[PDB]
């Protein structure tokens, strides 16, 4: 029974080290993660099918993020994603 709990916890103890989070709040945050995942993945799939592609590349994920997230949110998200993919490629 898989959940993004673990990771929510690692991020929390990175951003507010002495603060915990409740079980209910963990549930809500996990739901948040699943929802955003779904939305981005789905928009990406649509973009792919619309351009007659059959693959969801980094560039699909980027454009999905730019369609979905607003303003500064979108910009910062694009930035983080690009940084991550760059580091991955380097390694």
């Amino acid at each position: 029974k898989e959940s993004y709990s673990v990771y929510v916890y690692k991020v929390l103890k990175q951003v507010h080290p002495d603060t915990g989070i409740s079980s209910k709040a963990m549930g809500i945050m996990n739901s948040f993660v699943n929802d955003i995942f779904e939305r981005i993945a789905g928009e990406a799939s649509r973009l792919a099918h619309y351009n007659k592609r059959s693959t969801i590349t980094s560039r699909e994920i980027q454009t999905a993020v730019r369609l979905l997230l607003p303003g500064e949110l979108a910009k910062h998200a694009v930035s983080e994603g690009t940084k991550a993919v760059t580091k991955y490629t380097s390694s």
Partner: protein, 108 residues
């Protein structure tokens, strides 16, 4: 075999690039999924998580508490223009409302 370096790390991430990849691939978003795609999506998911949790801990401190709960998540998601636009049609259990009383109803 050479030692197994987790992709999350290879990436400098806490989030599970591995699981994200399974979900994209086994999740029928398309016939083929690149490595880049998992990495980027995992990163974006981490960023938004970070923002929400940060604002929530800020709220929790403002109310002198050590533990992030649903009401805190809710007040965080509503005080930011961008998160409130992202989650504008989402209901958070045990979150409550933001305090708001109209002017005309206030004492005169």
């Amino acid at each position: 075999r050479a030692k197994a370096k987790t992709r999350s790390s290879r990436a400098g991430l806490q989030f599970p690039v591995g699981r994200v990849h399974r979900l994209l691939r086994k999740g029928n978003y398309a016939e083929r999924v690149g490595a880049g795609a998992p990495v980027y999506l995992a990163a974006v998911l981490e960023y938004l998580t970070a923002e929400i949790l940060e604002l929530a801990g800020n709220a929790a401190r403002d109310n002198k508490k050590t533990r992030i709960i649903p009401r805190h998540l809710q007040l965080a998601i509503r005080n930011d223009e961008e998160l409130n636009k992202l989650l504008g049609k989402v209901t958070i259990a045990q979150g409550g409302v933001l305090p708001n009383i109209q002017a005309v109803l206030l004492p005169k």
